[PDB]
Design goal:
part of a larger assembly, 2 chains, A: about 250 residues, four-stranded antiparallel sheet, two-stranded antiparallel ribbon, 5 helices, B: about 350 residues, binds 2-acetamido-2-deoxy-beta-D-glucopyranose, secreted (chain B), transmembrane (chain B), EC 3.4.21.122 (chain B), serine-type endopeptidase activity (chain B)
Chain lengths: ~250, ~350
């Protein structure tokens, strides 16, 4: 919201406020001054993780969903909304999960899908194994398909046991949440920054593929892991967080 | 039936009625019982020390002396008692094993500084036809441990097994510069499929010296209570990357202990690791330290004193992803050696 006029009293009585703190500011210094823009960022709140949002904290929501910056002259609002007509949009913001077949979540009508870990990959990522290598494997042989163009394959070895010679061993085991060798799986775990989205849910690397028709490399809906939810509805009213940033 | 135990070396004593090992109180013990007690567990002409110590072992059926009777054996004069009459128990050292010069920066498995001489004073090198092949660790001047799959067929006769100690470099062990062969015992259950019992003792005829570069490593005790993520210090001249030959100098950096349930799970090693096989390394990427020596030992430092826990064995590709090293388990059979060291004299 830039280049316009506003106040506060019609605002905070026209939306059902439950709190309005501030930080780096005094609550009456809004009423006089003339800023340069305002940047309101809103989202709903999952109920049992509401205490993630303390100003300058650890947790899930401030670390892998939306990091509340503790430097500018922000002012945080916690309001409510009647649940007559409320349709929570639940869409995934990452490119490389919808590229590998992320359709949707199954949650209820009023459940908000937050995040736990947020893993980042490169541009040439391909979570399927190499099918022209994998046929001579016998032990631990994974599913595979053909990657799209330029996406380099997953690194899979047929290294040698004490007796068996072609037994499969790839990277990213068992799941990249709890991998044994973190310095080798391409899905690197990163913490989200100020004003960024969670760059992708983690893919379990061993549910992405089939055996016979090695098509373009897709995945399967059980394999995206690292998200949970809860219901926003408390006191018959879906609570909502919303930030403000009073820059300039 | 007599054995050492734990950190403070209490003699445990087995009785057929109590079916159990039991400690001896220090009520009128003597070196004529004590210095003649190291030949019971395979130490003929050596002894170090004996003192009184406080009881903390955990048995409530002690062993006492039948000094009221006349001249009988040690092994007849041992009845039970509920209390130690002076509250001192067996403390023992059968040999001058243990200490080194506590030095600082010996780290020459890849990316470090060389093993300082005298700070790993048990490190040997074994040779056939003067090429460096396998290592080991000394526990007596006459006995020497190594991995059994060096002494496998068709090289299973002792007269071609030349030990060569002392010098960090690949050169200075010359003919005469290192004592030589005798008896090759083996744990006689090595296999091709498992490599279960990949530990074979060796013997020498000529007793060497505890001078500077040579000192016997401490063999562990029955039930000495390691820690499940303990630090471990290996040594050896092994090739730091595979399809090599041998490193030039002595390399003695550090590794860690992986437990069973990580190695023996489904992804590392699919249910292979026996009770007589110990895993070691770090279950990680290319952070591991290879230095392949097949006997280049695993030395830990519990009770501020170096102890031997594992001698090396087979592995996978040199120090890479998911694939640790798997070590022979030399607290399992520290008494089998002590019934194969009893009757060489
Ligand atoms: C909900 O939607 C209906 C029709 O879409 C609308 O008439 C009604 O006013 C809405 N509810 C509220 C509280 O405004
Ligand atoms: C979520 O949706 C999928 C497909 O619609 C269905 O298989 C699953 O049973 C649903 N979850 C629950 C808890 O019913």
């Amino acid at each position: 919201f830039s280049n316009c006029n506003f106040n506060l009293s019609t605002l905070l009585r026209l939306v059902h406020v439950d709190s309005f703190s501030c930080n780096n500011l005094d609550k009456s210094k809004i009423f006089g001054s003339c800023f340069n823009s305002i940047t309101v960022d809103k989202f709903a709140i999952p109920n049992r993780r509401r205490d993630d949002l303390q100003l300058g904290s650890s947790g899930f929501l401030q670390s892998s969903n939306y990091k509340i910056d503790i430097s500018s002259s922000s002012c945080q609002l916690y309001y409510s909304l009647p649940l007559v007509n409320v349709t929570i949009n639940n869409f995934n913001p990452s490119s490389w999960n919808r590229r590998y077949g992320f359709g949707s979540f199954n949650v209820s009508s009023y459940d908000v899908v937050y995040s736990d870990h947020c893993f980042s990959v490169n541009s040439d990522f391909c979570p399927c194994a190499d099918p022209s290598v994998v046929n001579s494997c016998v032990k631990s042989k994974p599913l595979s398909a053909i990657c799209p163009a330029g996406t380099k394959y997953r690194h899979c070895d047929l290294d040698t046991t004490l007796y068996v010679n072609n037994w499969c061993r790839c990277s990213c085991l068992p799941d990249p949440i709890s991998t044994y060798s973190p310095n080798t799986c391409p899905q690197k775990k990163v913490v989200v920054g100020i004003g960024e989205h969670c760059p992708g849910l983690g893919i379990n690397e061993e549910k992405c593929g089939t055996q016979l028709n090695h098509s373009s490399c897709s995945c399967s809906p059980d394999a995206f892991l690292g998200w949970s939810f809860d219901s926003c509805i408390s006191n018959n009213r879906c609570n909502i967080f919303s930030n403000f940033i009073f820059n300039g | 039936c007599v054995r050492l135990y734990g950190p403070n070396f209490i003699l445990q004593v087995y009785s057929s009625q109590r079916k159990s090992w039991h400690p001896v109180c220090q009520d009128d013990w003597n070196e004529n019982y004590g210095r003649a007690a190291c030949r019971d567990m395979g130490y003929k002409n050596n002894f170090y020390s004996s003192q009184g110590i406080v009881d903390d072992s955990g048995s409530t059926s002690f062993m006492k002396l039948n000094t009221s009777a006349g001249n009988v054996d040690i092994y007849k004069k041992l009845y039970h008692s509920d209390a130690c009459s002076s509250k001192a128990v067996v403390s023992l050292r059968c040999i001058a094993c243990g200490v080194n010069l506590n030095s600082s920066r010996q780290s020459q498995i890849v990316g470090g500084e060389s093993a300082l001489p005298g700070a790993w004073p048990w490190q040997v090198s074994l040779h056939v036809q003067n090429v460096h092949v396998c290592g080991g660790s000394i526990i007596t001047p006459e006995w020497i441990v190594t991995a059994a799959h060096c002494v496998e067929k068709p090289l299973n006769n002792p007269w071609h097994w030349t030990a060569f100690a002392g010098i960090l470099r690949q050169s200075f062990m010359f003919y005469g510069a290192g004592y030589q062969v005798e008896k090759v015992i083996s744990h006689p259950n090595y296999d091709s499929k498992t490599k279960n019992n990949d530990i074979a003792l060796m013997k020498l005829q000529k007793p060497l010296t505890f001078n500077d570069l040579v000192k016997p490593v401490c063999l562990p005790n029955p039930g000495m209570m390691l820690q499940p993520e303990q630090l471990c210090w290996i040594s050896g001249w092994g090739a730091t990357e595979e399809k090599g030959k041998t490193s030039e100098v002595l390399n003695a950096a550090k590794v860690l202990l992986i437990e069973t349930q990580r190695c023996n799970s489904r992804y590392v090693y699919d249910n292979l690791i026996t009770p007589a096989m110990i895993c070691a390394g770090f279950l990680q990427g290319n952070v591991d330290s290879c230095q392949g020596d097949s006997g280049g030992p695993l030395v830990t430092s519990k009770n501020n004193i170096w102890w031997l826990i594992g001698d090396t064995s087979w592995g996978s590709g040199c120090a890479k992803a998911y694939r640790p090293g798997v070590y022979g388990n030399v607290m399992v059979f520290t008494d089998w050696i002590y019934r194969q060291m009893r009757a060489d004299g």
